[PDB]
């Protein structure tokens, strides 16, 4: 319904440093629109979204064994919440 939409939280030092600021970022399905992902976050974790941005990301084109191939195209999506932030306490721990 909408749990399927959220492909994975973004890892990496920048997403963590933002996660310290109360904004959260994850990869979502490339077909996903801004409204449905805002609603999917508001369903999946119960916080209100207050800001959004998204960015399609073609995969790095990589090669193994003289077989050259495109990798799956992601869609990163970053969102800021109102003062009831903190998401579920799944931070860096």
């Amino acid at each position: 319904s909408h749990y399927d939409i959220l492909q994975a939280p973004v890892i990496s030092e920048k997403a963590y440093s933002a996660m310290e600021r109360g904004v959260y970022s994850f990869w979502v399905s490339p077909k996903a629109t801004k409204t449905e992902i805002k609603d999917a976050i508001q369903q999946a974790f119960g916080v209100r979204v207050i800001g959004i941005s998204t960015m399609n990301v073609p995969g790095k084109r990589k090669r193994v064994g003289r077989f050259i191939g495109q990798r799956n195209d992601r869609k990163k999506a970053i969102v800021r919440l109102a003062e009831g932030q903190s998401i579920e306490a799944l931070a860096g721990q």
């Binding site: 749990y3 959220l6 939280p9």
Partner: protein, 54 residues
């Protein structure tokens, strides 16, 4: 009632995906096992749809 158990499966499935992006995923089998329970779910629903109504 079927949709409730479907979506309850979907939530933990996405939780497993979220850990799997992280270093924690000790039981990958639970991944695919969670999906067949979804499919069986949907399948059985169709198996009732034709039944009775004909």
């Amino acid at each position: 009632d079927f949709a409730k158990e479907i979506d309850a499966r979907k939530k933990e499935l996405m939780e497993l995906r979220f850990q799997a992006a992280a270093g924690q995923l000790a039981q990958p089998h639970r991944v695919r096992q969670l999906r067949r329970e979804v499919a069986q779910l949907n399948t059985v629903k169709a198996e009732l749809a034709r039944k009775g109504e004909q």
